[PDB]
Design a protein around this ligand. Sequence first.
Ligand code: HEM
Ligand code: HEM
Ligand code: HEM
Ligand code: HEM
Length: 211
Amino acid sequence: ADAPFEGRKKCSSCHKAQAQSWKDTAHAKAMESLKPNVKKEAKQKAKLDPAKDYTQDKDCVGCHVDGFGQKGGYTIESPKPMLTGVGCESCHGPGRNFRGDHRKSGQAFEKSGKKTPRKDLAKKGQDFHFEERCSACHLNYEGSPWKGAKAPYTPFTPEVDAKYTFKFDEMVKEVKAMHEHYKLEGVFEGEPKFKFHDEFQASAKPAKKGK
Ligand code: HEM
Ligand code: HEM
Ligand code: HEM
Ligand code: HEM
């Protein structure tokens, strides 16, 4: 299922709270890391040039940007800021086809209490899982548990430093890495439902910022 990427604009418009927490995460700042003389000591350890400008290097940008190599995604040729850094769609999926339902359903639910099955969103490409997406970026190195690893490889792996051992079940649970979770009224329900969804929502900060 391949809908085109559009970038963070509308997601952040309707989901300000999340986009507000997100803009502080490392993912949000991903392209910064590629600039010269930035994150120099970690670059040297991975044998990368701390003074080189990697921001247009095709062996790097694919993982610090939204949907590189995909319909509607980031291109080096013509950078689009709404698609730079790993944004909403890098985890939630290209949303050209599913945000449409986020609007309609929101209104249906507000007007008459109606709810929509996640199945419709998953059919239109929304991601409720999200491990394969993270893996393409984090476990793209020979010897990792992810099949289909091919150059360009993630230069930061356990061999460089143990902090880089990626464990989805632990890492999806770090709001400083993903983003803070806020309370849903539950306009969407049912399968495919994320395995930690009820847990995240059980402890979410109260909603805020309109709809
Ligand atoms: C291309 C040669 C390239 C560069 C340059 C680059 C740099 C870079 C930096 C400076 C970091 C931060 C490291 C730190 O410890 O602070 C970083 C982090 C990650 N990268 Fe990267 N990166 C380049 C290329 C790639 C490619 C091709 C991928 C995906 C296959 C990729 C992925 C990642 C991931 C994942 C991280 C996070 C590591 C972690 O904290 O677990 N990078 N990159
Ligand atoms: C981009 C700025 C972005 C938006 C917008 C966004 C929104 C969003 C919402 C509304 C939820 C549900 C409610 C909540 O606050 O928990 C949600 C949930 C998850 N997100 Fe997200 N999200 C954006 C970006 C990202 C990125 C880049 C990642 C991955 C690093 C990510 C991950 C997650 C995860 C995991 C959840 C939980 C899913 C669930 O409980 O069903 N989001 N996001
Ligand atoms: C999928 C839900 C997913 C998870 C989980 C995840 C986690 C994660 C962590 C914990 C970090 C470290 C953050 C920190 O130290 O503060 C991290 C860092 C990067 N990630 Fe990631 N990540 C997930 C998904 C993805 C995807 C799909 C990509 C590639 C488009 C990606 C890339 C990166 C990069 C790059 C970093 C480093 C940021 C920087 O300092 O440059 N992640 N991720
Ligand atoms: C942009 C492509 C975009 C993303 C990404 C996104 C994500 C998202 C998630 C993860 C949820 C939660 C679904 C679940 O319960 O598993 C969610 C929910 C709602 N969204 Fe959204 N959303 C994106 C875009 C938009 C846009 C542009 C709007 C507004 C026109 C919008 C609206 C909503 C509404 C309403 C919900 C339901 C809230 C509730 O409390 O149940 N989204 N979105």
